[PDB]
């Protein structure tokens, strides 16, 4: 007998994923082709990603977009998890560029629109891919782009940054190879800039066989622009490939760019009762704020100081990290708990900064205001540290 799951007959190996291997499969009746990702349960247990796998499955299951690979079904067995996904016969974009060379301006634009459309859709759903690269962009028989392999992806949470180094060095943003924290949509945009370059030039903008040189080239943001490149798209590349993440193009910026707007299909980007209400709403010297509290003093000094002041106010805390504390205060009136996170950051060599972040409560209707209780909790500590 053949290897058969959910009426699909398991064929040739397409490649190897973070877990297991991805294989082609063919329906015993219709001959329909799918891509089956095999996840070994004892392997996902070894490095404990089990929750990280469960959230990827939840998210990808809901995703419906023409330029993202669809997840049809997840089939569970005692030993293994099988992810049945849509199959596209064209293979990696990377292989396509290797064999056929650079794509002309119109074809590059057409593909780059489809891809960015997918990236945007992910971001609108609070998912960052982080592995974007031509090897992870597949093609169907008609040369439509399909984003695949969300194995390195992550969900964006309110007030949270990501420290995880991810993806290939060639497609990673200067902040990612530098190990710094990031929000994450700006990282997908940097990678998308590298993909755009690859489409237009048939080469990578940052590449060196010497790894320290490659990292410097990336953090410098310097790359070669061939003579045959449209000055218009060069400006778009310059914006997407900005080293400074605050200066780097957003998806809104790219949609407004003239080179991107040419020939743009209407279906690609989203822009009944819920839509109408939103339209109605839209139709209808100074003080200088600053973040947290700063001290020119030393990091071990300022950490000891906070813990002392936390204890003084009867608060309780967990040291999750040397510089990251989780605090829980009992409220005398409501007899409830109010939680906040403390993190120290380095502003410059001589200065450090303590950050206060509110933690959302578990509770159903309860007395008093969460936002205010959060303020009062910080206020008490700040008075001491001021």
């Amino acid at each position: 007998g053949s290897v058969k799951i959910g009426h699909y007959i398991l064929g040739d190996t397409l490649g190897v994923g973070t877990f297991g291997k991805v294989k082609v499969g063919k329906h015993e009746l219709t001959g329909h082709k799918v891509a089956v990702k095999i996840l070994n349960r004892q392997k996902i247990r070894s490095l404990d990603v089990v929750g990280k796998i469960r959230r990827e499955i939840q998210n990808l299951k809901l995703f419906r977009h023409p330029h993202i690979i669809k997840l049809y079904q997840v089939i569970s067995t005692p030993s293994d998890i099988f992810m049945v996904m849509e199959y596209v016969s064209g293979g990696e974009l990377f292989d396509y560029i290797c064999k056929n060379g650079r794509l002309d301006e119109k074809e590059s634009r057409r593909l780059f629109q489809q891809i960015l459309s997918g990236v945007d859709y992910c971001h609108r759903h609070m998912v960052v891919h982080r592995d974007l690269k031509p090897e992870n962009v597949l093609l169907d028989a008609h040369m439509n782009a399909k984003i695949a392999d969300f194995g390195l992806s992550n969900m964006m949470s309110d007030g949270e940054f990501l420290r995880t180094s991810c993806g290939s060095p060639n497609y990673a943003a200067p902040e990612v190879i530098s190990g710094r924290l990031y929000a994450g949509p700006e990282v997908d945009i940097w990678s998308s800039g590298v993909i755009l370059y690859a489409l237009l030039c048939g080469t990578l903008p940052f590449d060196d066989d010497h790894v320290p040189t490659l990292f410097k080239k990336i953090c410098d943001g310097i790359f070669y622009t061939p003579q045959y490149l449209n000055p218009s798209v060069i400006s778009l590349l310059k914006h997407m490939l900005q080293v400074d993440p605050m200066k780097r193009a957003t998806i809104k910026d790219i949609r407004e760019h003239e080179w991107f707007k040419q020939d743009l299909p209407k279906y690609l980007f989203p822009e009944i009762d819920n839509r109408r209400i939103m339209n109605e709403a839209k139709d209808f010297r100074k003080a200088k704020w600053h973040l947290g509290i700063r001290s020119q003093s030393r990091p071990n000094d300022i950490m000891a100081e906070v813990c002392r002041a936390i204890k003084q106010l009867d608060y309780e805390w967990k040291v999750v990290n040397p510089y990251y504390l989780r605090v829980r205060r009992k409220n005398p009136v409501t007899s409830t708990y109010s939680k906040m996170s403390l993190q120290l950051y380095q502003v410059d060599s001589r200065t450090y900064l303590l950050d206060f972040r509110s933690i959302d409560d578990e509770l159903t209707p309860r007395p008093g205001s969460h936002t205010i209780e959060f303020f009062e909790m910080c206020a008490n500590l700040i008075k001491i540290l001021a």
Binding site: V3, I75, P78, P299, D355, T371
Partner: protein
């Protein structure tokens, strides 16, 4: 329906021929198709206890890594228990996952500050033609963080932006020291 539950039988090792025999097939020999060093068959088994053994290149053996059972006659077979929890994805991930720090105690480099937090929503001027209570749409990463004004006239001013569904509220509190 629930009588058909997919089960993977995998032999890791070399061979010219590998067969599977179990209680489920009446100890017949089911040939396993190969991929490299993996021989596999996938079978629907009823929920319950099942015993099996392999025939590898003329030698009857059991998988040492999988569980085993031993008969009073000295037969050594692999044994497998079909559980309904194995066939629902999220239930099986719950079981895989299974396999008090609040009390306060007496007791690397600091992460560099992400520049995203230096974008202050209240330091941003808006248009004179619009409601002054209105604000720009916040970066999700800026939410829940605490911002403040330099204490003046014995009064401290705290602020944070929180989200409610698809809407955002930036709240300012005026509290005296």
């Amino acid at each position: 329906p629930a009588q058909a539950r997919p089960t993977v039988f995998r032999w890791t090792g070399g061979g010219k021929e590998v067969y599977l025999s179990g209680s489920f097939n009446n100890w017949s020999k089911l040939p396993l198709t190969r991929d490299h060093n993996n021989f596999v068959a996938i079978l629907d088994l009823p929920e319950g206890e099942h015993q099996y053994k392999f025939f590898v290149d003329g030698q009857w053996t059991h998988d040492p890594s999988e569980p085993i059972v031993t008969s009073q006659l000295g037969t050594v077979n692999n044994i497998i228990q079909v559980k309904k929890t194995d066939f629902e994805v999220f239930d099986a991930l719950m079981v895989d996952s299974q396999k008090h720090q609040e009390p306060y105690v007496c007791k690397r480099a600091p992460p560099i500050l992400p520049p995203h937090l230096l974008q202050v929503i209240l330091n941003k001027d808006t248009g004179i033609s619009c409601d002054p209570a209105l604000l720009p749409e916040p970066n999700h990463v800026m939410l829940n963080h605490l911002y403040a004004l330099s204490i003046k006239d014995g009064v401290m001013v705290l602020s944070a932006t929180h989200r409610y569904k698809k809407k955002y509220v930036t709240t300012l509190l005026y509290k005296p020291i």
